[PDB]
Amino acid sequence: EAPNQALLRILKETEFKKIKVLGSTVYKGLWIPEGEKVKIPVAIKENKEILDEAYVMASVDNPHVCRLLGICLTSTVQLITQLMPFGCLLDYVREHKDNIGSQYLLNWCVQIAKGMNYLEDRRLVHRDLAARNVLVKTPQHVKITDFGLAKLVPIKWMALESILHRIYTHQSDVWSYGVTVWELMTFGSKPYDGIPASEISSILEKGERLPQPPICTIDVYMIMVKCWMIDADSRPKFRELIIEFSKMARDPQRYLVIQGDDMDDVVDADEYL
Numbered sequence: 001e002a003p004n005q006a007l008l009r010i011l012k013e014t015e016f017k018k019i020k021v022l023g024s025t026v027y028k029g030l031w032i033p034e035g036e037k038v039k040i041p042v043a044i045k046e047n048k049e050i051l052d053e054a055y056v057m058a059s060v061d062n063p064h065v066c067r068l069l070g071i072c073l074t075s076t077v078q079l080i081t082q083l084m085p086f087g088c089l090l091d092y093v094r095e096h097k098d099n100i101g102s103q104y105l106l107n108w109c110v111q112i113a114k115g116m117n118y119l120e121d122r123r124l125v126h127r128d129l130a131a132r133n134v135l136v137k138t139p140q141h142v143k144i145t146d147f148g149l150a151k152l153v154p155i156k157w158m159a160l161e162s163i164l165h166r167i168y169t170h171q172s173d174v175w176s177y178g179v180t181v182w183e184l185m186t187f188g189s190k191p192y193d194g195i196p197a198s199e200i201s202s203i204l205e206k207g208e209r210l211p212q213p214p215i216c217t218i219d220v221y222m223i224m225v226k227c228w229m230i231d232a233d234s235r236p237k238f239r240e241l242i243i244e245f246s247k248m249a250r251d252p253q254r255y256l257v258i259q260g261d262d263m264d265d266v267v268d269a270d271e272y273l
């Protein structure tokens, strides 16, 4: 009901340099706003769908969500955004599975919940929350991205009511939050590995759920289980998840049990306002 006064910035292609490939296309590069004396590390993602994505990314502004810097309209529609140098959190947990402590895991849970609470504040349902869609700015700071599915298909992350009746709500996102947390606490295991997507709705209806990760106390796993209640309004709210994971982050070893616990003018997008 409130007007969306977000600014869509159209960026000249001549302001982008050092373009190199990250995956397939998404590239890294440098954005030098003309007449600004600043170099900004960026990712660039290479039509109604990409622009629906650009619409949502330009309309968010929160420390735990990735925002659109602008678009470039040359041969292709390119989305320009802050470079998140450590890549996706799923690949990060898998590679550093032996250097990741309780403080980091719980802090990431708090930050993802903050991002999702903000989206709820903005009446946005993400619909694709997953560890592959959280990026790592630094090991201390992650942010939610990939809004090409958000509104005002990944079966193994979806609430049962979404699989059965294509019903999507903030509380359906809470279910996906629970699955994302399970991915982190297993250092990136695949949910329901080897179980075909077609059989997922059947398993969930019988009462089966993802199992307790070895490092998780019952305190942490019980929160995960609450996100998978059949009654959507019985699941936690994101603002409650922030609270509970914050409490646990003050004493992380009580809640997770882990054995062993081009440079002069560079400005990060978070300091470029």
Ligand SMILES: COc1cc2ncnc(Nc3cccc(Cl)c3F)c2cc1OC(=O)N1CCN(C)C[C@H]1C
Residues within 6 Å of the ligand: 022, 023, 024, 026, 028, 043, 044, 045, 079, 080, 081, 082, 083, 084, 085, 086, 087, 088, 091, 135, 145, 146, 147
């Ligand atoms: C350095 O790594 C990355 C940093 C990113 N910073 C921002 N956004 C990124 N994506 C993005 C998402 C939505 C909208 C826009 Cl506009 C985006 F630009 C980033 C992607 C990155 O790359 C990966 O995570 N990799 C890991 C290696 N695989 C091969 C896969 C490949 C995907």
